[PDB]
Design a protein around this ligand. Structure first.
Ligand code: F3S
Ligand code: F3S
Lengths: 309, 309
């Protein structure tokens, strides 16, 4: 059984920075260090940080004065940001720069009183944070998830409208939504394409190439990871059997029994160590040496704040 | 006399990467190493590298077969790139990712036979490289440097038009040019704002703050450094005497004689040691301890290609 590895895969620049922010805060100031929401959507990472003394909370009000607080890589609303600022707390923002970029544009539109449309999935923390950047009553901030939502959307002034997107969406599906947006609102303004980050675009591209060769595709990632779900979804839609798994232990023998080529990849929040064990498990199940596919090189890095190096 | 230091200033991610690419190539392959155009626009860096075995050329026909060639941070045209590919040469690309991003958009428009307009300064290597990404006779690639250029430009089909910009332009002036573009071509499409990179935006914002306090501003950077010139220009427009200098030796006493507050900054391609020597000279001229102004903390880093680690 041939084992193929997608490339690129795993850690993106934002996740690497976010994790290091928590680790370094712990190393430099010791436990406890409070984090609002899972720093990244990966069970393994969250469990490890918790075992090292990190305390994940849901509301800032749960954090004691004088403590250290970290915002997750997914970003937060202005209300959350302002609340933390007024509190007697030391705050370290692990929001990925690529999300902050979108935030700024939403705040800009809110400032001008012009309506904005966000393409994203309801309930996701990034969507919560991004829409949480808009607060001008005269304008408006709407969420659409599909062409259907666009078809049924109504706004105040279609002449002054702009759109933004979540960073981890399906490249293919988002294209459909944007097409509907421009057909419905010809004067809508946005970026040259969308706000899907380089990591999401690259990983979907890599899984596309993987799926072309593999019968089965294993995606290392947690259930609450948007980008990870998109990778498994892409493989499945290409006609291959795909499984989202947190670790090698989730692998069932029947999944790969008699399979000649199995592909493995990882969402932006899954550590390489997890992939290594997946490979090891597949090997004790008949797999040979893992073969890395050729892929787009990524060279972006986001440094942790100077105070935490 | 008080000495203030702008923040941020100096090295950007693209310059640091480009220099490292040349240094690593020299270490790995030894001298000589050819580089198309000054790797970055800084005399100090270029002189040193040249002494280390790097040979800077403008045309590929200047490079011998079997040699190693590296494209500068500013980027190159598709014509130059293909001429390099056809020739017997080992090629490495130090083009800054933020320039490549613009290239890809120009290439897209070219393939579609749709016209594009570049906002930039004629003759600059980046402009030649970016415009050199367009090669479709049906469409068009036009360069505009000011609103006046816009007011006199005519295109084949303004219904299918887009724009791009040089990465090192004056933020203020570019705004004026874009305002003109949209007024003359209401259907023109572009990025949300422009293609001016984070480093240029940040250094201009930083010099703006510096100039509000300093009577005289010294900008460390070479004469051919586009972004460096923009920094001195901004200060001058604010009514402050500003000088673009390569090193401490260029400082004339009359410039700071009897001046109570002198500010110092540096273009994106100027090494920090140059700034340190400038401060040393100002202290000899009566200046006290250098005081860094508070500023936007930059965290972007671009890694060198794996083949040059
Ligand atoms: S927006 Fe940021 S943290 Fe990762 S998947 Fe994309 S880089
Ligand atoms: S485009 Fe690239 S090399 Fe420096 S000034 Fe801007 S980052």
């Amino acid at each position: 059984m041939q084992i193929l590895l997608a490339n690129p895969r795993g850690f993106c620049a934002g996740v690497d920075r976010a994790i290091s922010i928590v680790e370094n805060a712990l190393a430099i100031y010791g436990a406890p260090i409070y984090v609002r929401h899972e720093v990244v959507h990966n069970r393994y990472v969250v469990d490890s940080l918790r075992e090292r003394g990190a305390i994940f909370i849901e509301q800032i009000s749960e954090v004691p004065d004088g403590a250290i607080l970290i915002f997750s890589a997914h970003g937060v609303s202005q209300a959350v940001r302002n609340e933390a600022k007024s509190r007697d707390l030391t705050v370290f923002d692990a929001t990925c720069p690529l999300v902050t970029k979108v935030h700024m544009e939403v705040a800009r539109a809110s400032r001008r009183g012009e309506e904005s449309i966000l393409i994203g999935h309801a309930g996701h923390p990034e969507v919560e944070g991004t829409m949480g950047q808009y607060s001008n009553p005269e304008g408006g901030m709407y969420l659409v998830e599909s062409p259907d939502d666009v078809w049924k959307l109504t706004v105040k002034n279609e002449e002054k409208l702009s759109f933004m997107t979540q960073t981890t969406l399906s490249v293919d599906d988002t294209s459909d939504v944007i097409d509907a947006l421009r057909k419905r609102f010809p004067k809508i303004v946005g970026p040259r394409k969308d706000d899907i980050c380089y990591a999401t675009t690259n990983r979907q591209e890599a899984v596309r190439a993987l799926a072309e060769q593999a019968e089965v595709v294993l995606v290392v990632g947690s259930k609450n990871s948007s980008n990870s779900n998109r990778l498994a979804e892409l493989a499945q839609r290409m006609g291959k059997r795909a499984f989202l798994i947190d670790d090698a232990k989730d692998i069932q023998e029947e999944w790969v029994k008699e399979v000649k080529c199995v592909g493995v990849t990882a969402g932006a929040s899954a550590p390489d160590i997890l992939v290594q064990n997946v490979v090891a498990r597949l090997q004790q199940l008949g797999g040979g040496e893992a073969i890395p596919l050729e892929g787009r090189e990524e060279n972006i890095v986001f440094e942790v704040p100077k105070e935490l190096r």
